[PDB]
Design an enzyme around this catalytic site. Structure first.
Site, PDB file in Angstrom:
ATOM      1  N   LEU A  17       0.851  -1.208   0.000  1.00 34.68           N
ATOM      2  CA  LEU A  17       0.000   0.000   0.000  1.00 34.68           C
ATOM      3  C   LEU A  17       0.864   1.226   0.000  1.00 34.68           C
ATOM      4  O   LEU A  17       0.515   2.229  -0.628  1.00 34.68           O
ATOM      5  CB  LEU A  17      -0.958   0.025   1.185  1.00 34.68           C
ATOM      6  CG  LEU A  17      -2.110  -0.985   1.167  1.00 34.68           C
ATOM      7  CD1 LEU A  17      -2.916  -1.094   2.455  1.00 34.68           C
ATOM      8  CD2 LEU A  17      -3.074  -0.727  -0.006  1.00 34.68           C
ATOM      9  N   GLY A  18       1.997   1.179   0.705  1.00 38.41           N
ATOM     10  CA  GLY A  18       2.867   2.359   0.784  1.00 38.41           C
ATOM     11  C   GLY A  18       4.140   2.018   1.527  1.00 38.41           C
ATOM     12  O   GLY A  18       4.188   1.023   2.291  1.00 38.41           O
ATOM     13  N   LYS A  19       5.160   2.885   1.394  1.00 35.60           N
ATOM     14  CA  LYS A  19       6.488   2.758   2.112  1.00 35.60           C
ATOM     15  C   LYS A  19       6.948   4.151   2.538  1.00 35.60           C
ATOM     16  O   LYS A  19       6.824   5.067   1.737  1.00 35.60           O
ATOM     17  CB  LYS A  19       7.598   2.149   1.211  1.00 35.60           C
ATOM     18  CG  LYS A  19       8.093   0.769   1.587  1.00 35.60           C
ATOM     19  CD  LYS A  19       8.694   0.076   0.368  1.00 35.60           C
ATOM     20  CE  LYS A  19       8.896  -1.431   0.560  1.00 35.60           C
ATOM     21  NZ  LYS A  19      10.319  -1.924   0.549  1.00 35.60           N
ATOM     22  N   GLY A  20       7.464   4.332   3.765  1.00 34.60           N
ATOM     23  CA  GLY A  20       7.706   5.685   4.290  1.00 34.60           C
ATOM     24  C   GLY A  20       8.903   5.843   5.219  1.00 34.60           C
ATOM     25  O   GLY A  20       8.762   5.742   6.440  1.00 34.60           O
ATOM     26  N   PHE A  21      11.646   3.858   7.083  1.00 38.38           N
ATOM     27  CA  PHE A  21      11.181   3.240   8.319  1.00 38.38           C
ATOM     28  C   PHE A  21      10.285   1.999   8.094  1.00 38.38           C
ATOM     29  O   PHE A  21      10.651   0.872   8.439  1.00 38.38           O
ATOM     30  CB  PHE A  21      10.360   4.254   9.144  1.00 38.38           C
ATOM     31  CG  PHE A  21      11.183   5.152  10.026  1.00 38.38           C
ATOM     32  CD1 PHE A  21      12.450   4.757  10.485  1.00 38.38           C
ATOM     33  CD2 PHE A  21      10.676   6.403  10.429  1.00 38.38           C
ATOM     34  CE1 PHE A  21      13.197   5.603  11.310  1.00 38.38           C
ATOM     35  CE2 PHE A  21      11.418   7.251  11.258  1.00 38.38           C
ATOM     36  CZ  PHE A  21      12.678   6.847  11.703  1.00 38.38           C
ATOM     37  N   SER A  23       6.543   0.019   6.205  1.00 42.16           N
ATOM     38  CA  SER A  23       5.835  -0.392   5.050  1.00 42.16           C
ATOM     39  C   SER A  23       4.383  -0.712   5.469  1.00 42.16           C
ATOM     40  O   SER A  23       4.180  -1.244   6.559  1.00 42.16           O
ATOM     41  CB  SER A  23       6.514  -1.697   4.617  1.00 42.16           C
ATOM     42  OG  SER A  23       5.941  -2.113   3.477  1.00 42.16           O
ATOM     43  N   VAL A  24       3.391  -0.398   4.644  1.00 38.85           N
ATOM     44  CA  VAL A  24       1.990  -0.830   4.902  1.00 38.85           C
ATOM     45  C   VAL A  24       1.555  -1.755   3.788  1.00 38.85           C
ATOM     46  O   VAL A  24       1.698  -1.405   2.583  1.00 38.85           O
ATOM     47  CB  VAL A  24       1.013   0.324   5.112  1.00 38.85           C
ATOM     48  CG1 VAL A  24      -0.386  -0.209   5.341  1.00 38.85           C
ATOM     49  CG2 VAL A  24       1.425   1.065   6.369  1.00 38.85           C
ATOM     50  N   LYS A  43       1.063  -2.629   9.168  1.00 39.44           N
ATOM     51  CA  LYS A  43       2.278  -1.860   9.145  1.00 39.44           C
ATOM     52  C   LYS A  43       3.425  -2.631   9.766  1.00 39.44           C
ATOM     53  O   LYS A  43       3.250  -3.187  10.861  1.00 39.44           O
ATOM     54  CB  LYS A  43       2.103  -0.519   9.899  1.00 39.44           C
ATOM     55  CG  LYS A  43       3.379   0.346   9.730  1.00 39.44           C
ATOM     56  CD  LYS A  43       3.180   1.846  10.186  1.00 39.44           C
ATOM     57  CE  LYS A  43       4.519   2.628   9.975  1.00 39.44           C
ATOM     58  NZ  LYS A  43       4.268   4.055  10.436  1.00 39.44           N
ATOM     59  N   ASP A 137       3.885  15.297  11.497  1.00 35.83           N
ATOM     60  CA  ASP A 137       3.970  14.918  10.047  1.00 35.83           C
ATOM     61  C   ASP A 137       2.617  15.062   9.387  1.00 35.83           C
ATOM     62  O   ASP A 137       2.188  14.229   8.545  1.00 35.83           O
ATOM     63  CB  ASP A 137       4.467  13.442  10.014  1.00 35.83           C
ATOM     64  CG  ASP A 137       5.043  12.968   8.687  1.00 35.83           C
ATOM     65  OD1 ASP A 137       5.423  13.727   7.758  1.00 35.83           O
ATOM     66  OD2 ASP A 137       5.117  11.676   8.573  1.00 35.83           O
TER      67      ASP A 137
HETATM   68  C1  LIG Z   1      -0.223   6.756   5.146  1.00 28.82           C
HETATM   69  C2  LIG Z   1       0.884   5.893   5.089  1.00 28.82           C
HETATM   70  C3  LIG Z   1       1.970   6.285   5.904  1.00 28.82           C
HETATM   71  C4  LIG Z   1       3.140   5.536   6.050  1.00 28.82           C
HETATM   72  C5  LIG Z   1       3.113   4.363   5.315  1.00 28.82           C
HETATM   73 CL1  LIG Z   1       4.582   3.354   5.528  1.00 28.82          CL
HETATM   74  C6  LIG Z   1       2.059   3.943   4.506  1.00 28.82           C
HETATM   75  C7  LIG Z   1       0.882   4.700   4.334  1.00 28.82           C
HETATM   76  C8  LIG Z   1      -0.192   4.255   3.604  1.00 28.82           C
HETATM   77  N1  LIG Z   1      -1.214   3.628   4.283  1.00 28.82           N
HETATM   78  C9  LIG Z   1      -2.162   3.330   3.351  1.00 28.82           C
HETATM   79  C10 LIG Z   1      -3.337   2.740   3.709  1.00 28.82           C
HETATM   80  C11 LIG Z   1      -4.336   2.390   2.794  1.00 28.82           C
HETATM   81  C12 LIG Z   1      -5.534   1.822   3.233  1.00 28.82           C
HETATM   82  N2  LIG Z   1      -5.758   1.643   4.554  1.00 28.82           N
HETATM   83  C13 LIG Z   1      -4.759   1.968   5.489  1.00 28.82           C
HETATM   84  N3  LIG Z   1      -5.010   1.782   6.806  1.00 28.82           N
HETATM   85  N4  LIG Z   1      -3.568   2.474   5.065  1.00 28.82           N
HETATM   86  C14 LIG Z   1      -1.763   3.817   2.118  1.00 28.82           C
HETATM   87  C15 LIG Z   1      -0.514   4.393   2.268  1.00 28.82           C
HETATM   88  C16 LIG Z   1       0.248   5.078   1.251  1.00 28.82           C
HETATM   89  N5  LIG Z   1       1.421   5.549   1.506  1.00 28.82           N
HETATM   90  O1  LIG Z   1      -0.170   5.413   0.132  1.00 28.82           O
END
Ligand SMILES: Cc1ccc(Cl)cc1-c1[nH]c(-c2ccnc(N)n2)cc1C(N)=O
Length: 291
Positions: A17-20, A21, A23-24, A43, A137
């Site tokens: 879903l995402g990476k930022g 440290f 990962s989700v 996460k 943040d």
């Molecule tokens: C928001 C966010 C912050 C840090 C990290 Cl590591 C991942 C996310 C993230 N979280 C999600 C997400 C998407 C759907 N549900 C939840 N609970 N989270 C998407 C993303 C993204 N970056 O696009």
């Protein structure tokens, strides 16, 4: 028997879903192994050093302590055998990050909708400050969209708890820092407070009103104002000088005066003069009522 206890062997990976440290991932928690289980967001750390694990376990307690309509819901944790690596389990919010969502729909989301999101973000933040937490943040990339009518603050990875006797938290050795959303005193003194979150909220309101147009993002605009030739630590030096001289992001094209006024009030150099999130929520709801 305890549904906050998730067994990792039953977490099936579905997609990143995402990476930022951190990962989700989107996972299905599927202990009957028949693809009927609940879909959840998970996460985890990319480098689960002892130092990071410690900060991550504090992040998990922060999230577990927040119960509000505009804060993503904690569901549980996964523990591993031995070295005790951790995964945080949260509700899956299916429209994804507000930054992606607004980048995708752009002006098909109208001002009324933008101010509904604004109000909800304000309320999540007001509630967070009643617990004496400082988000550090606040940016559309950390807000998540449940459905067209509801957004929620979606990550707490830099969130700090205020000391008992202080109204700020000072970061001694900063990590990666989203400097384009930072208040001047955060850039100069690494001091974070409710009032520095309010400065960042004005940057969120700017993002919303530019519809995440790339050439208009806070990094692009501040780099333009300090000069694109500035690099590494010189960017922070020239950004501190710019903000001290009242250099600010511009009014977004088409932005209503009453909204633009709120942004510029959040970006006061004088920490005490920034509005409170209590008052922002009132004002934004009055604006919405007026429309
Ligand atoms: C928001 C966010 C912050 C840090 C990290 Cl590591 C991942 C996310 C993230 N979280 C999600 C997400 C998407 C759907 N549900 C939840 N609970 N989270 C998407 C993303 C993204 N970056 O696009």
């Amino acid at each position: 028997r305890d549904p906050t206890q998730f067994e990792e062997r039953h977490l099936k990976f579905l997609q990143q879903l995402g990476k930022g440290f951190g990962s989700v991932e989107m996972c299905r928690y599927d202990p009957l192994q028949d693809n009927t289980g609940e879909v959840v967001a998970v996460k985890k750390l990319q480098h689960s050093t002892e130092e990071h694990l410690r900060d991550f376990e504090r992040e998990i307690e922060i999230l577990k302590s927040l119960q509000h309509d505009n804060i993503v819901k904690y569901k549980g944790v996964c523990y591993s055998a031995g070295r005790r690596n951790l995964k945080l389990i949260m509700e899956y919010l299916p429209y994804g990050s507000l930054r992606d969502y607004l980048q995708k729909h752009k002006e098909r989301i109208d001002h009324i909708k933008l101010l509904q999101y604004t109000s909800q973000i304000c309320k999540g933040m007001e509630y967070l400050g009643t617990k004496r937490y400082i988000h550090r943040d606040l940016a559309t990339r950390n807000i998540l969209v449940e459905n067209e009518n509801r957004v929620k603050i979606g990550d707490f990875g830099l969130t700090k708890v205020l000391p008992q006797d202080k109204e700020y938290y000072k970061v001694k050795e900063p990590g990666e820092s989203p400097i384009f959303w930072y208040a001047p005193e955060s850039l100069t003194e690494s001091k974070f407070s409710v009032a520095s979150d309010v400065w960042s909220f004005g940057v969120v309101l700017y993002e919303l009103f530019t519809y995440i147009e790339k050439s208009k993002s806070p990094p692009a605009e501040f780099m333009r104002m300090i000069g694109n030739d500035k690099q590494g630590q010189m960017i922070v030096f020239h950004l501190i000088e710019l903000l001290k001289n009242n250099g600010r992001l511009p009014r977004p094209d088409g932005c209503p005066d009453e909204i633009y006024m709120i942004m510029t009030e959040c970006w006061n150099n004088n920490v005490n003069q920034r509005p409170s999130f209590r008052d922002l929520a009132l004002r934004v709801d009055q604006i919405r009522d007026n429309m």
